[PDB]
From a paper:
The endoplasmic-reticulum aminopeptidase ERAP1 processes antigenic peptides for loading on MHC-I proteins and recognition by CD8 T cells as they survey the body for infection and malignancy. ERAP1 is a member of the M1 aminopeptidase family, which is found in all domains of life and plays numerous functional roles. These proteins contain a thermolysin-like domain10 (domain II), which holds the active site. The M1 aminopeptidase family has a conserved HEAT-motif-repeat domain (domain IV) forming a bowl-shaped C-terminal structure.
To examine the effect of active-site occupancy on ERAP1 conformation in solution, we used a tight-binding tripeptide analog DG013 (IC50 = 33 nM29), which has a phosphinic group expected to mimic the tetrahedral intermediate that would form at the scissile peptide bond during catalysis. We determined the X-ray crystal structure of ERAP1 bound to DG013 (see “Methods” for details) and confirmed that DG013 binds as expected to the ERAP1 active site, with the enzyme adopting the closed conformation in the crystal. The binding pose is similar to that of another phosphinic peptide, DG046, bound to ERAP130, but distinct from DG013 bound to ERAP2, most likely due to lack of an aromatic P2’-binding site. In the presence of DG013, ERAP1 Rg decreases by ~2 Å, an effect observed in multiple measurements and for two independent protein preparations (yellow circles). Fitting the ERAP1 + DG013 scattering profiles to molecular dynamics structures revealed a cluster of models consistent with the experimental data (Χ2 < 1) with theta between 54 and 62° (yellow symbols). This cluster is distinct and nonoverlapping with that observed for ERAP1 in the absence of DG013, and consistent with a conformation similar to but slightly more open than observed for ERAP1 in closed-conformation crystal structures. In the ERAP1–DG014 (open) complex, (cyan) as in previous open ERAP1 crystal structures, Tyr438 is oriented away from the active site and moves to interact with the peptide bond transition-state mimic phosphinic group in the ERAP1-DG013 (closed) complex (magenta), in a position analogous to the previously determined bestatin-bound ERAP1 closed structure. Reorientation of Phe433 and motion of the helix 4a is coupled to rotation and tilt of helix 5, which repositions the side chain of Tyr438.
Residue numbers in the entry: 46 to 110, 115 to 527, 533 to 915
The structure:
């Protein structure tokens, strides 16, 4: 009979200091550990409950202070807990020391204390051991009070062979030759931090280091053959760390900051205090082969983790229900920091795709509020979704633009200083914001309306001369009674000046000083809502876009497109009028509106490919190509221009070459011929590399040649482009081979499996293979990627969310229901089901309409 029955830990036993000794054996893939945890008790008890998972406990003692007493061990695998029973009840106010000896073996997965391998340039395979403890994986490496609220200090000691190199959260204090033939590294003691931030790495990495203007030792570790790609990472890391220190007015508390490129990683990165971990693709930059997209991604990722150093590490959420207080703030500090440190990137151009893609799912009935209760690890992993990142950052952007940027900065500085080295709830942020908003600004109620209910509002705007009527309702892809405090912003045809109005009720009205030709709400996509215009409003905006699209901003044009199509999804606008608005892209030239038009148009022919709709689908693809043909023709085949122009060129050339624009196809075939005859030695323009590989991979010869180069390539961008090209094939046998080998993890590492599966589910001849593979290997995939993880969500959605028929809907429902306790309760499952339902509705309503509209559009030249 186990003396505990709740998933949460007892509140009356608090740890204060962990002392960890880990001996990891790379040859036998084992490790023995000793954990000494100093605790205090507030209620007299003889039972100590803590976390432990897949760890063999062999010995347990309890020291008082002199006196040491044995503890009896009880195990609960369902709750991932152990209970330690003490002969004499603990005395309140006294410090005790629990000492546990345990053993286990490096996880073969992507979490806990797991193994990674890398290939040398001589073909040899080398092994290292890394950590990934967020959210509840520290218990797989050391028994502890594995919750973010039980903060404590950590004194770490790691045992290794001499041939190895050990790094952790703190600097290395000393090395002692314990026993014979293996060294023991004693690291400095950490600060008050949560348990999920513990990390340690045993490898043979090389490193590059640099000093900040504040004296912190910033270093970047990687495998020996890839250390020469860490320069941009290190430089941007120093710049962003100095920026964050200066901005928050709070120095970095640790002596050193490390950025390690792990060969086997699940997430993009991890914010381990003093030892951030990354994907090699997400940290390393090769000037010869990496793309401008890759450079921007590295910059944004480094900014994200260095922001986590404050939002998450210094001030941590108390429970995983408010994980957005970490993740949304970090995703927003990405923008706030990079837009200052690397202004040549101009991240304000590409930020709001996050808000749009987040609305795509938050408009669903299965969506959840930004802050929602969770208990078990599957739910906690599910919390790392588009809401907590994208929607959190978008509502934070809206709040910072409603308040002054100066007021937002003062609020966040007060927040971090008041709650440093502690935990916060959702309400502490609103308290810190209301301590600054004193012009009649109740931040609390507004942000409660934005964080405590799901979805986002639709604002309908009616104009009767000089009167502007505004009505808010809950946008829901088919009546609840939700209400927001929407800080509306708008401009008129008579003024580029931004006028504001705070809509706190269902309907309201303001008075213009003069009649206007058009009015545009949600200026610059700084608000997390969508806008509909009554009467001839959409016609007026269509005329504006087709006449002088430069009358409004790039973000405004993108928001117009996205809002038009999302309103088609609920009937406030016809699909025909939406496409009439889309026709303006024939003269569009900016990256954000073009990319938004593509992101809103591609899913339609993606839905059509899954059905018998060849004529209408071909008409649609031809129309899409003819829409951008002028811009595609004007695009050059070089690496010229800014980062924005380079990414635009790459995507345009890839799109044209995929949809069979014969000039693009001919030139890409020529480049691929010259390259293949050069044996990969010819340097191709990184921007056109995607299109060249995608064209060359259509034939079996070029496909096999590309794969032959894949094994030995060392550029992560080159690897990703090769993956995309190989997934673009029509050979079912090769698709099956890619799937199986990326699953096995030998020829293609498993970290790339979810993206490869998603691309193959996009493939018009591969989607049954992807769906069937996910179904038939669900068990091992779940064991590898954890339940409810963003990887599982990505796989499920990439394999199913393009289905459009009731037969497919029943397939999905039946399979995920028969899964029972192994994934039937997945929020991603519910979201895919609702997405398929909305796809069915949208297809039954708009497909034949689109066919008629395409015939009408061909009858236009
Ligand atoms: C992980 O486990 C492996 C295997 O149990 C350990 O390898 C063994 O390590 C010991 C001590 O280093 C070796 O003994 C010594 O080998 C050297 C080799 O020149 C010899 O000169 C010494 O007199 C002594 O025999 C042992 O040979 C070696 N076994 C083999 C064949 O690899 C490894 O050390 C463990 N790593 C740690 C520190 O956890
Ligand atoms: C990873 O480490 C664990 C230990 O933490 C290894 O567990 C060991 O597994 C073997 C094989 O199952 C166990 O032997 C078994 O004994 C049970 C009855 O006690 C018997 O029913 C089984 O048929 C088998 O003979 C062994 O007991 C267990 N560890 C301990 C200390 O009991 C595990 O094998 C390691 N990883 C892998 C992949 O093996
Ligand atoms: C690029 C940048 C924003 C870094 C960031 C890493 P972190 O700093 O948000 C880390 N703390 C995630 C921790 C984690 C790991 C595994 C399961 C759940 C939670 C990221 O990759 N975001 C992606 C991908 C992602 C987040 N959680 C994941 C969990 C599994 C797989 C992928 C992900 C996103 N926008 O979600
Ligand atoms: C949304 O989904 C839930 C199931 O969790 C269902 O009970 C509810 O009825 C759905 N929406 C509506 C229209 O009520
Ligand atoms: Zn994060």
């Amino acid at each position: 009979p186990f003396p505990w029955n709740k998933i949460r830990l007892p509140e009356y036993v608090i740890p204060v200091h962990y002392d960890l000794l880990i001996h990891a054996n790379l040859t036998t893939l084992t490790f023995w550990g000793t954990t000494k945890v100093e605790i205090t008790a507030s209620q007299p008890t003889s039972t100590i409950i803590l976390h432990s998972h897949h760890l063999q406990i062999s010995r347990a003692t309890l020291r008082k202070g002199l006196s040491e007493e044995p503890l009896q061990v009880l195990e609960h695998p369902r709750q991932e807990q152990i209970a330690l029973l003490a002969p004499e009840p603990l005395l309140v106010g006294l410090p005790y020391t629990v000492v546990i000896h345990y053993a286990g073996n490096l996880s073969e997965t992507f979490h806990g204390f797991y193994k990674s391998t890398y290939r040398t340039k001589e073909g040899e395979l080398r092994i290292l051991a890394s950590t990934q403890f967020e959210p509840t994986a520290a218990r797989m490496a050391f028994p502890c009070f594995d919750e973010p609220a039980f903060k404590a200090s950590f004194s770490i000691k790691i045992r290794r062979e001499p041939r190895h190199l050990a790094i952790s959260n703190m600097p290395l204090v000393k090395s002692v030759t314990v026993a014979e033939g293996l060294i023991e590294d004693h690291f400095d003691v950490t600060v008050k931090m949560s348990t999920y931030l513990v990390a340690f790495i045993i490898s043979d990495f090389e490193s590059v280091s640099k000093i900040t203007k504040s004296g912190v030792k910033v270093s970047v570790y990687a495998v020996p053959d890839k250390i020469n790609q860490a320069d941009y990472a290190l430089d941007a890391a120093v710049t962003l760390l100095e920026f964050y220190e200066d901005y928050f007015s709070i120095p970095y508390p640790l002596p050193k900051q490390d950025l390690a490129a792990i060969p086997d990683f699940q997430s993009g990165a991890m914010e381990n205090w003093g030892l951030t971990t990354y994907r090699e693709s997400a940290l390393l930059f090769d000037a010869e082969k990496s793309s401008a997209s890759s450079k921007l991604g590295i910059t944004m990722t480094v900014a994200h983790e260095l922001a986590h150093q404050w939002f998450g590490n210094l001030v941590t959420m108390e429970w995983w229900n408010d994980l957005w207080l970490n993740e949304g703030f970090a995703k927003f500090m990405e923008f706030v920091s990079v837009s200052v440190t690397h202004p040549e990137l101009k991240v304000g151009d590409y930020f709001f795709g996050k808000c749009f893609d987040a609305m795509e799912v938050d408009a669903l009935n299965s969506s959840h509020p930004v802050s929602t209760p969770v208990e078990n690890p599957a739910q906690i992993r599910e919390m790392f979704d588009d809401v907590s990142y994208d929607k959190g950052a978008c509502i934070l952007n809206m709040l910072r633009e409603y308040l002054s940027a100066d007021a937002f900065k003062s609020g966040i500085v007060q927040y971090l200083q008041k709650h440093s080295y502690k935990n916060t709830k959702n309400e502490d942020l609103w308290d810190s914001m209301a301590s600054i908003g004193g012009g009649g600004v109740d931040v609390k109620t507004m942000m409660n309306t934005w964080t405590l209910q799901k979805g986002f509002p639709l604002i309908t705007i009616t104009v009767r001369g000089r009167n502007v009527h505004m009505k808010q309702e809950h946008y829901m892809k088919g009546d609840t009674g939700y209400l927001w405090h929407v800080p509306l912003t708008f401009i008129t045809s008579k003024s580029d000046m931004v006028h504001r109005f705070l809509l706190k009720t269902k309907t309201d009205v303001l008075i213009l000083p003069e009649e206007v030709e058009w009015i545009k709400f949600n200026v610059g996509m700084n608000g997390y809502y969508i806008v509909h215009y009554e009467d001839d409003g959409w016609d007026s905006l269509t005329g504006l876009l087709k006449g002088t699209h430069t009358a409004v901003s790039s973000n405004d044009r993108a928001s117009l497109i996205n809002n038009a199509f999302q309103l088609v999804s609920i009937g406030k606008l016809s699909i025909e009028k939406a496409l009439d608005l889309s026709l303006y892209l024939k003269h569009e030239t900016e990256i954000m509106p073009v990319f938004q038009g593509l992101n809103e148009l591609i899913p339609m022919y993606k839905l059509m490919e899954k059905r018998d709709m060849n004529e209408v689908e071909t008409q649609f693809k031809a129309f899409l190509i003819r829409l951008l043909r002028d811009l595609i023709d004007k695009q050059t085949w070089t690496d010229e221009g800014s980062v924005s122009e380079r990414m635009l060129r790459s995507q345009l050339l890839l799109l044209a070459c995929v949809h069979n624009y014969q000039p693009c196809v001919q030139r890409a075939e020529g480049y691929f011929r010259k390259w293949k005859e050069s044996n990969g030695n010819l340097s191709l323009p990184v921007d056109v590399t995607l299109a060249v590989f995608a064209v060359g991979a259509q034939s079996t010869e070029g496909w096999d040649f590309l794969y032959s180069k894949y094994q030995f390539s060392l550029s992560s961008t080159e690897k990703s482009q090769i993956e995309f090209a190989l997934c673009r094939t029509q050979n079912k046998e090769k698709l099956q081979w890619l799937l199986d080998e990326s699953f096995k993890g030998d020829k293609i590492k498993t970290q790339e499996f979810p993206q490869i599966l998603t691309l193959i589910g996009r493939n018009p001849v591969g989607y049954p293979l992807a769906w069937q593979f996910l179904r038939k290997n669900w068990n091992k995939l779940v064991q590898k990627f954890e339940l409810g993880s963003s990887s599982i969500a990505h796989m499920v959605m990439g394999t199913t969310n393009q289905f459009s028929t009731r037969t497919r809907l029943e397939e999905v429902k039946g399979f995920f229901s028969s899964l029972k306790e192994n994934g039937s309760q997945l929020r991603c499952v519910q979201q895919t089901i609702e997405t398929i339902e909305e796809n069915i509705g949208w297809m039954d309503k708009n497909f034949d309409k689109i066919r008629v509209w395409l015939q009408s559009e061909k009858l236009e030249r």
